[PDB]
Design a protein around this ligand. Structure first.
Ligand SMILES: O=C(NCc1ccc2sccc2c1)[C@H]1CCCN(c2ncnc3nn(-c4ccc(C(F)(F)F)cc4)cc23)C1
Ligand SMILES: O=C(NCc1ccc2sccc2c1)[C@H]1CCCN(c2ncnc3nn(-c4ccc(C(F)(F)F)cc4)cc23)C1
Ligand SMILES: [Cl-]
Lengths: 468, 472
């Protein structure tokens, strides 16, 4: 990986664009103002370690960038001198200071989350060179936020229909491995999901967490055996019962998920699971239930009909809240067409039909990890302060067309209000000490990570109020 | 170091226990299922995955032990198929006994056709075909980026030809701004590579290194860029010094095209008063080869572009081209780089045509729309098992959910053929064996750990050409 080639093309030309005698460039990141009123800050530590720390400049990487940019621009605009200065004076370590709110923190929209500035007047251009790298923080931030908002919905309806939050952490399972754009995205996004839940089929997220964050337990996420359409349909259309019987027998003492919509979902629940193989189901342990998985049709209508079918073939109880409950050896997972919008429609529809959320878990793939954009939380990186000719000026952009696009001014700090909320102070006014100490911590300075967090601390920082 | 044993969906670790006993072959295919309609898809991206993740010695004793340890904790049971993976290590030196056949990269294929097939070449590795489903299915992303980018090229081609009379500079009309708007570094390189199948302009440098490394081009670089300002380089001069920043930047880049974002404070003021009066003398002296490209970054995309053009038309000498459409002087152009996606792009060029503005005046930049706002759902990319051999007898397998007709899968051994009318057809149940449809267009691209056929990025670009381009 070459950091010289890891930025937007036009930033190669920006060192020629600042006012002469600019010694400091200071920029910040924010999620500008389900409304997504607060965001989980997560992901920066991965980027600091993988891409920014240590000796990131070498003579080979300088020559490599020079050659590519010569052709890419059909001209020689690359700042070979500036990158050679960093190589010689700092042994390839970036003269940059980054301050950030602790990872896992839940911060309302419109607050400074991290800031970036150069620690050497010669590398004024370096602050915004690494904008492209740092701005991709939007994705772990957005995945963790949107997953936590789904946890809020599940927590509300689980508590309503069951009376507690038992198993809340396993109610949203990550199916997004094949639905995302790359391997690296799969690991990043799955790790952001594991901030809030414990269930994932995306194995790459586990290795990311151990390498860059760490956890007391051996792994941060868990899975169960499960069938796919290929392992069912390979038996032939007339032998779906044989496949079902073989699979739950092979996994008789662990939980097993079995997709049951290969040909007819309703038929499989009523006659195969509910009549032919019913004796293999009711014999199952509470620890290892059969989890029927519908994979097609309208998500809410399918779940309700599936439950109504199973309720008439199996012994239903009424829990202490008055809500119906399958026997402990039988559960349901809906892992098709689940995003935050449809998830809300399902649990509300289940509650209206007096079904407890204990009966169901959810799986999400593309919605959980792929259908998200930087626009969703307005993740933005803008320069707020420069020093030219020895006097610093507060800088901002205020487009006439859009008020929302307006940016913060000057040196920034994050503080607690007297009522315990968050406030971002502008124009260096945090130096007046009317709001206490600045919340941001130096996490990166001059090529070294100076403060880090375990994935256990991040999980505790990210918990819901209902859980506290 | 990447471990292929840890690069699949968790539950596929347990699937070797789930197939019918005495199964010697598992045969699966990839397609963009039938449901801007997206009637045809550019096949691109598989060669990247074959080389980066699948070829060579991908199994080692350390990687087997590593997977065993993680899996035991992950499932809280021992389900990992250590025996099957050690067989591949000892018998084939860690090379995957798999054969992959595929339509050539760059080919434009209508929806509902087999694009590649996967099968095991050793009866002991029946489970391996679908183990690598997750790795292979991620080809949906370069396929979808290339298809959606080509569809935007179609729109630009139609309106450029209508308002100008030719397609000059079409391959530069959609610029890739998506580096910071995507989910990771690897995604940025893959997606920018798929955009360069259809265009030449990119700010995502990672796509260039991917192409050189995995595909290659006769030319030194696949994509090109121009110097450009951002809000940070303008606003750093101060509120009252936007004119100073403008003047400094166009003078530093007197000799090449330079894009200057002009909406930091007031976009309309910048074009009418600053570009159009204060600095007009630095603009009109510019060469045709190195024009000033004014960039508006906010407000309604169509309304801003129209008002910007109306402002510039009154401060600068406009001509009427041979089609009757208005044209800025060659030293002055416009680029709209905000809020551009396939739907918005169509709205802009149509609105420009209604106001008698040539598409020659404008280029477009897209970030999130071009590379991040796409899903596997859009082209219905799907990987399914269509054929298996059990007890020596091959059977055609498929899924036919009652709730959804669209979810139904193809049956048996598959082949892709040219029809008598020149269209494409996918033959099911091994019927391609009959030879009534000509030669199978799928070629073996991967067999037993080796990439057996590869394509240059030059061939891919030729294969993906628009019909309008061919006639011209
Ligand atoms: O009772 C436990 N287990 C068995 C169990 C109970 C309820 C349900 S509801 C769907 C599955 C399931 C399974 C203990 C032991 C630990 C789990 N516990 C859980 N409590 C509440 N809801 C849970 N959902 N899942 C779950 C979700 C998705 C998947 C899959 F297939 F996608 F990977 C697998 C399991 C676990 C839940 C506590
Ligand atoms: O002298 C050439 N062009 C100058 C030119 C003409 C029209 C326009 S309209 C926007 C820019 C522009 C620039 C030759 C040489 C090669 C280019 N030619 C092109 N012909 C037609 N449309 C083109 N758009 N772009 C373009 C788009 C985006 C960006 C960026 F990076 F800022 F985003 C830069 C340039 C080039 C066009 C032919
Ligand atoms: Cl999905």
């Amino acid at each position: 990986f070459n950091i010289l080639l890891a930025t937007d093309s036009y930033k190669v030309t920006h060192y020629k664009q600042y006012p002469p005698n600019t010694s400091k460039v200071y920029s910040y990141f924010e999620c500008r103002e389900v409304k997504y009123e607060e965001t989980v800050f997560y992901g920066l530590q991965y980027i600091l370690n993988k891409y920014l720390k240590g000796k990131v400049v070498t003579k080979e990487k300088i020559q490599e960038a020079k050659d590519v940019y010569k052709e890419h621009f059909q001209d020689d605009v690359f700042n070979e001198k500036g990158w050679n200065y960093i190589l010689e004076k700092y042994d390839g370590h970036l003269p940059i200071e980054i301050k950030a709110v602790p990872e896992g923190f839940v911060i309302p929209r419109g607050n400074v989350l991290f800031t970036v500035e150069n620690t050497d007047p010669e590398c004024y251009w370096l602050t915004n060179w690494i904008e492209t790298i740092l701005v991709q923080s939007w994705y772990p931030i957005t995945v963790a936020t949107n997953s936590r908002e789904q946890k809020k919905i599940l927590a509300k309806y689980l508590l309503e229909t069951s009376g507690n939050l038992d198993g809340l952490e396993y109610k949203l399972h990550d199916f997004g491995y094949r639905g995302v754009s790359s391997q690296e995205t799969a690991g990043i996004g799955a790790s952001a999901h594991l901030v809030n839940f414990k269930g994932t089929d995306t194995v790459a997220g586990l290795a990311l967490i151990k390498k860059y964050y760490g956890t007391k337990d051996p792994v941060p996420g868990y899975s169960v055996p499960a069938a796919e359409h290929s392992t069912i349909t390979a038996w032939g259309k007339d032998h779906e019962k044989d496949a079902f019987e073989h699979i739950v027998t092979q996994f008789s003492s662990v939980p097993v998920s079995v997709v049951s919509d290969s040909y007819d979902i309703y038929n499989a629940c009523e006659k195969i699971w509910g009549e032919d193989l019913r004796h293999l189901i009711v014999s199952r342990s509470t620890q290892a239930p059969l989890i029927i998985r519908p994979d097609s049709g309208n998500p809410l209508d399918t779940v309700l009909k599936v439950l109504e079918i199973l309720g008439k073939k199996f012994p239903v109880t009424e829990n202490s809240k008055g809500y119906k409950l399958l026997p402990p050896y039988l559960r349901v997972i809906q892992g098709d067409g689940v995003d935050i919008n449809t998830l809300q429609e399902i649990v509300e529809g289940m509650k209206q039909k007096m079904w407890s959320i204990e009966n169901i878990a959810f799986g999400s793939g593309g919605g959980l990890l792929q259908k998200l954009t930087r626009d969703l939380l307005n993740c933005s990186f803008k320069c707020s302060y420069v020093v030219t000719n020895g006097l610093g000026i507060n800088v901002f952009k205020d487009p006439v067309a859009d008020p929302n696009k307006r940016s913060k001014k000057g040196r920034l700090s994050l503080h607690r209000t007297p009522a315990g909320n968050f406030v971002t102070l502008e124009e260096g006014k945090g130096d007046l000490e009317e709001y206490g100490q600045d919340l941001l911590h130096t996490v990166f300075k001059n090529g070294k990570v100076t403060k880090s967090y375990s994935f256990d601390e991040i999980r505790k920082n990210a918990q819901l109020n209902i859980e506290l």
